[PDB]
Amino acid sequence: VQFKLVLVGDGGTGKTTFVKRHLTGEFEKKYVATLGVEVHPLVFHTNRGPIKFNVWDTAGQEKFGGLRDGYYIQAQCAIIMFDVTSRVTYKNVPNWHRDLVRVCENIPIVLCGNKVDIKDRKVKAKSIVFHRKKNLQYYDISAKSNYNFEKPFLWLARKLIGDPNLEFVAMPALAPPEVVMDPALAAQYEHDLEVAQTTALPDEDDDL
Amino acid sequence: GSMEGILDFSNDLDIALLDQVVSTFYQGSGVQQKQAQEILTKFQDNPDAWQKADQILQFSTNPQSKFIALSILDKLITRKWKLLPNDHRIGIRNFVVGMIISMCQDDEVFKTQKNLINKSDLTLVQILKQEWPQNWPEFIPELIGSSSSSVNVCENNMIVLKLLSEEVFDFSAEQMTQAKALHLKNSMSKEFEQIFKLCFQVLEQGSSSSLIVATLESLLRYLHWIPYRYIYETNILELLSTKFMTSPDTRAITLKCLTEVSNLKIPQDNDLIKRQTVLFFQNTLQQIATSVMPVTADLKATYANANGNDQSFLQDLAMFLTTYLARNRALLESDESLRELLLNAHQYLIQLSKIEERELFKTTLDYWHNLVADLFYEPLKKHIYEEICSQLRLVIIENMVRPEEVLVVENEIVREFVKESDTIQLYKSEREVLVYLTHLNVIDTEEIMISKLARQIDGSEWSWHNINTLSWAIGSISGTMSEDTEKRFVVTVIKDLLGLCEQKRGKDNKAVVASDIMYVVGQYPRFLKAHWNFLRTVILKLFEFMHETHEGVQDMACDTFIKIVQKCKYHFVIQQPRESEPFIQTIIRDIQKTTADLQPQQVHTFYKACGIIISEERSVAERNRLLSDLMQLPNMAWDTIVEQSTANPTLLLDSETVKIIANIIKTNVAVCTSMGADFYPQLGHIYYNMLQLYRAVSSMISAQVAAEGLIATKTPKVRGLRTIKKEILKLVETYISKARNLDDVVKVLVEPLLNAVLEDYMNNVPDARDAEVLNCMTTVVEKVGHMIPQGVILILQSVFECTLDMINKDFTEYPEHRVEFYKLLKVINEKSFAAFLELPPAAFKLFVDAICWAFKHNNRDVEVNGLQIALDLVKNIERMGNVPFANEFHKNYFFIFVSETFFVLTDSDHKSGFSKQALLLMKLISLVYDNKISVPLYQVPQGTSNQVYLSQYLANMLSNAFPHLTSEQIASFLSALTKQCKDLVVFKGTLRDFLVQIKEVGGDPTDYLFA
Amino acid sequence: TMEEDEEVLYKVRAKLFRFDADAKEWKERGTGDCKFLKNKKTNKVRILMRRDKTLKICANHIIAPEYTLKPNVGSDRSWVYACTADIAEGEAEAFTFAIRFGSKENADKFKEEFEKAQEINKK
Ligand SMILES: Nc1nc2c(ncn2[C@@H]2O[C@H](COP(=O)(O)OP(=O)(O)NP(=O)(O)O)[C@@H](O)[C@H]2O)c(=O)[nH]1
Ligand SMILES: *[C@@H]([C@H](C(N)=O)c1cncnc1)n1cnc(-c2cc(C(F)(F)F)cc(C(F)(F)F)c2)n1
């Protein structure tokens, strides 16, 4: 039960950071431009079963665009991403959209305005209307704060599975094993643990 | 494995190997996929891959492989077409044409290869942009002709025309020069009569839906630009509004066509056109009622059910109705025979407005705001819409979104986590419409609200959702009623809401109802001001909630307190009748009791609200006494902590002491924020010891880095010591930015400040420098810089070079220093430019470097200040006129700024700054074309004008940077650009025309004569 | 769900990290409710933690008695400890974990409860 999801938008808007948060739970602060595309599978557990997305995280910087619209072939859904701290990225949303629906003419598409965590917002809420005429779903999101991070995938999953009441459910939790530590490498986990103890956790001013 | 073989072009291409790489990319996974991807990218990027295109299209069995071949041609056509020899051009044309014809005659390919035929049409369209009509003038005639040969070719011709209209009218601004865009637009316009014929015949004929839907999709595009006559002087509106509304195959595209038709503004004097605008609306609404849904249908349930394309049809319908009615409802409001039409349409909108779908609601709420604003001003309209407005009151009141202020929520009623900002704009838009609807009929709004309320008292309708949405609505209409009706309204509402918290017991009930009363009372300050006995009771009740164990209620009680005080402060400073003292006196006396269970942040808000009150007292002597009373606790704790720091300066080790100091300083910051200039006596009380404590904590931090390494700046202890330093800086900044007595700022504050902060900043290691030092200095320079020229010099010397070295190795480290640094250079450059003149020549050169380094950031905060500094700096040098410093400035730096500006304009990585980059460049060029540079810019024959040398420098500069341009392109560009250096808008157009030409070969040099 | 055969001894909101010893950085793994669950049938106590809105497991492992909570150099509200058999991602991998809480009180109460559990598992 798997669906091809293409992710598009200008460079720097936070596409790869958004996926990676869903893959691993981490927040990558560095900007390493995506080269062509990166494919990751991503599974959600719903009350209607598991749904699997094959996420084609494509590249926003033109000089890294690779096959460009060639990535869109046979996509079943998509996310268009812009950055609400960068007006230029909203203004290009119509260009990504044009190129996406020339290849994929009838697929569910979400428009996501990322980085609403940043105090100085530039793309005002009232100004975000492109999606109305094109029947896109729209959400404010932040990959850094997780604000609404799940809503694009919950929406798409409802549209793909055909069930507006589909919800995410807790995966069942198998008993964990009773493993005793290895005395051969017990003198070794002094070091691995020393490093981690003296590396400071990121973002110590956060509420958590 | 051996997938990389296709990258070797020595041999011929193994098509079957190509196809295996492709299917490994699309259909594979993991590493083989990731490796096939890199192979295909390298294959595509090869400047000769296009030659392999026709053999991939001839002999391949993979549609994806052919797609990728076409992407390779597209790249070649868009960027390098005119460098091809003419024979390859026609070969490529005839190949692409022939593959299209060939695919549209094979009924099986036509059905199953839609993606590949679309890609081919787009490729053909790329060839038209380059070749049509000047080297292909019969394209449109042949296309019309060939449309009779087949139904598959006619259908596909529509796709080509749709993609052509898009590329010419909808997406040409950014991708073509002005001149080329005009040329293709005029060419399409000239040949549209014929195109319309084909499209109108197809639509009347009526083959099958597949051709129809494509002809309509093309029509959607034409309507963005074609003349009104093609719509109103034919029978095409009757077709759209009737025939194609009935079939659901065509109904979606037709509605979108009718929305575009709507949106135009009609010639507002012709009775015929007006009647036609009415008729197509009347036809459309009859087909909806009869063939889709009657006006009573439950569109909320239909949309929730999400069968088929319902959700999209309802959205398109909402967009059609709102679009047409905002433009044209006046066509329906006077003729009595049009009244049911007007109202049925608005009745559909009432039903659309009950769907649960935020974004769809926002779309309809925008229309309702347009309506009710019109009805508040236009004479004789509102009675027409009375029953609509009555229904809208109920819709809005039952779907109020939670306001910012209401900090409780359900998951179990608990506290918020996050500032819902997708909700902030909605609430405001709901409030605005509801406030208008209350003006339009205040009696009906009250009756709705009081009855809904009567039916909560009864438990007849009780629930979290219902009492809340009602309460938020009741709050949101503050200021629409008369003071007298308000009086009786609020009384009733409060009486009823009090009854409700006594009935609904349990910890979750009482938190819901308490948040609702706080919201409501906080929203009616006019009432509170007039009913002092009630105001006093409200405040005492809020003080009570400050001891509540439910953290949501408690945090809300603090915010409600200061929200009330911002509006009613005057009533807390005067002595009220029947009161032994101003109420401020009672609040201050009891502050330790009132605030004892609050978190520190909430304590500081409480003190901030007391400062708002104290600043209402304008007798200086009485204000300063209130201020010292308010500050008694933090000042006794301060006087204690400072005798115990001076005697044996080591107690500050103590993590508890550190927290205590920071909260003292944060308390002063809170009170200073609301008292402003009036805070000065309190600041003077602590200033000298505070600056000594600053030096003392600075020593502690230094000594901990020294003993533990850089990692010490991550420890709780050192972050706490730095918090002390940051808060001291914030307090000083906060005071200085509101001070009215600048003479005291300079004579009392500034010198001890600079002695305390600047060397400590300069001689710390980089990871221990606080960027707040920079922010503090920026306010100092902003507010009194003009009075402290030697102080500004001193600031530069201490922070300029050492900060630059922190931030000039990449664009990412020390982000906050970066931003604060360019903010400080900006203010110094506009207010104390003399500081830069006394800079040594080496350091002035680092300053120019610093400005240019900012241009290259993508971080907009930095970039924009960089461009502004550069512009202001030019103005500053120009103002010196003809003197040595300015002439040596031009000799040394003029061409550095021209070329760096040109770099960021053309590298495609700094688009956000185009407008300011163009501004800077036009200023620079204009300096030379007004002989405001009184010195030769060169080291070339003597007597040469600076204008001639500038042209020469720039032609050489662009020739080496863009060697694929011809000399004539460059020369025409510079001629246009220099001629337009007093006309920013045209200058910008000319730069945009250049940015287009540098992306292709063979740009036409006459394009720069466009203006 | 596979949890109704268990009793909740302790719940707290936390943020969980996993140390990438190759990159030498901590990497967040999830943010949600951290629970101590005591198996009604075996009396074995585990940590189970789920992400807030996807509800995805981000920690599932026995609160072994061999484990020891250490402080992290940057925080007075966090604990580092090494885990040999965590199944949140599937195969029982080994991790160095850090878990941070809203406050230092939350962190200290967690350490108390974590240690009590170790005694219970000591049987
Ligand atoms: N403050 C904030 N920053 C974010 C957020 N999401 C992503 N970022 C930041 O945006 C920057 C770009 O990261 P990235 O996810 O790779 O963006 P991208 O669109 O995938 N880049 P590309 O298209 O070139 O491959 C990073 O620095 C990242 O920390 C967010 O939600 N909030
Ligand atoms: C009900 C009840 C009570 N008799 O005060 C109560 C409920 N919770 C906690 N403590 C007491 N109740 C609920 N809310 C109020 C209330 C709230 C305000 C305030 F929101 F603070 F403005 C004001 C008033 C008053 F001014 F007294 F009407 C009452 N009472």
Ligand SMILES: [Mg+2]
């Ligand atoms: Mg990316």
